[PDB]
Amino acid sequence: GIFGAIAGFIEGGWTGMIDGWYGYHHENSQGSGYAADRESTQKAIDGITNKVNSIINKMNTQFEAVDHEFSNLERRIGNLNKRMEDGFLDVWTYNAELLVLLENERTLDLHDANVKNLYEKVKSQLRDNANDLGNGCFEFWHKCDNECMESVKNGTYDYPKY
């Protein structure tokens, strides 16, 4: 991925996080757990759902082949009909196959960007108050209880305290 997060500085995914695409793993005195980030997950779902439906809608016409027949003295127009039908078959196959390859590349990139920005959102909140380990994890220098954790996740972490 071009943004460097997925299968990058965050080496792998979490099978333990089941309720969304992007999120957090926290660890403190009360223990450990996974939690989806719902804002960025929902925004991604809406975007990709919109992309899938737009593709489905733009592809919502059909070229109609007919098997009208042609006599042996209509070789020219019979072949004209064949080359034209094959003609549209080839451009629509090209369009569909090329669109899917192009959209797949950009879809994976989008997810990669989203993990990266989520990581940045948290880095920007903690600043001094935590150590960036380089793998998506931050070690706090102060104690962070459950409400401290939740304030990082909902983006209201209060830096002047602690």
């Binding site: 793993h25 098997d67 899917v100 959209e103 990082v152």
Partner: protein, 325 residues
């Protein structure tokens, strides 16, 4: 005390291709192409298809005697012609503008058979001996097309000028057929129509027709060295047809009130079974039951089908790269 940022992984083995990379496992994806068919014909708009069975299109619509099962009124959502149909044009000859006829019929929905010219239309001639062993029915060894009547001279008298007229007063166009006989030699010609230069002339407000017999011995087909030139046309609402002939006329007897479809219409050449089921999408090689956007089954269909495409797969990534640990 620590907080980590990360992403979903799961047990998916489903893969997609990208421009930069083949065979990439992703957490979620959707397949857009259908490659599955039910190998059968079904009803469309819960109106049934017309199976020709052992008759071709020409045999059915000319009224070949061995096609009596089909004879009369028919409604259809599309037509299935079987590749090994034996009952077509029994008395050898060319049906003129055959390909345009099939296209016209394919654009249709319903035919009502009716008597256009009763045999008693044609004054001073015989209307009861126009049979042949080339055209057996299932009971007689010598019959003829139920929609045509082979007119022959009577008793001794020269075959006179006969005339017929029909003003289409209805609201539906009329599909009708006629013919011109071409005997193998000049004695068969005289035995049937007498001496003199013969003609078949027909006309409407928008159409003229005129042809003469062309006497010659053609290669034997179904035991006949003679030929018939078959013809068809469409009489529009408000038009009237005049038939004038003094020899060789294969007269129009019955004809079809024709209802033009607003949908697409199709003539499938196939040996697939017609079964008791419904469909919204019918291709020549089977029914498709899908929500999918593409299909690689057939370019040829009736109903509302997915776009045809040569691809084996069109899998779109929705989720992210699956990297479990």
């Amino acid at each position: 005390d620590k907080i980590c940022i990360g992403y979903h992984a799961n047990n998916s083995t489903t893969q997609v291709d990208t421009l930069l990379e083949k065979n990439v496992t992703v957490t979620h994806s959707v397949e857009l192409l259908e490659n599955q068919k039910e190998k059968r014909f079904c009803k469309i708009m819960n109106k049934a298809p017309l199976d020709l069975k052992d008759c071709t299109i020409e045999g059915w619509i000319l009224g070949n005697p061995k096609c009596d099962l089909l004879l009369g009124d028919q409604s259809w959502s599309y037509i299935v012609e079987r590749p090994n149909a034996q009952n077509g044009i029994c008395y050898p000859g060319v049906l003129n503008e055959l390909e345009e006829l099939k296209a016209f019929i394919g654009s249709g929905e319903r035919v009502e058979r009716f008597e256009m010219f009763p045999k008693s239309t044609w004054a001073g001639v015989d209307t009861s001996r126009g049979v042949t062993n080339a055209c057996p029915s299932y009971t007689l060894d010598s019959s003829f097309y139920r929609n045509l009547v082979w007119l022959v001279k009577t008793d001794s008298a020269t075959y006179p000028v006969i005339k017929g007229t029909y003003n289409n007063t209805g609201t539906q166009p009329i599909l009708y057929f006629w013919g011109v006989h071409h005997p193998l030699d000049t004695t068969v010609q005289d035995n049937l129509y007498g001496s003199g230069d013969k003609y078949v002339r027909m006309g409407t407000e928008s159409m003229n027709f005129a042809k003469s017999p062309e006497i010659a011995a053609r290669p034997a087909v179904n035991g006949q060295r003679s030929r018939i030139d078959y013809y068809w046309s469409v009489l529009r609402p408000g038009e009237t047809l005049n038939v004038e002939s003094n020899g060789n006329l294969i007269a129009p007897w019955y004809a079809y009130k024709f209802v033009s479809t607003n949908k697409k219409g199709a003539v499938f050449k196939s040996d697939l079974p017609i079964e008791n089921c419904d469909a919204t999408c019918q291709t020549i090689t089977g029914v498709l039951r899908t929500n999918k956007t593409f299909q690689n089954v057939s370019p040829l269909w009736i109903g509302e089908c997915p776009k045809y495409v040569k691809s084996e797969s069109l899998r779109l990534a929705t989720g992210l790269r699956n990297v479990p640990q």
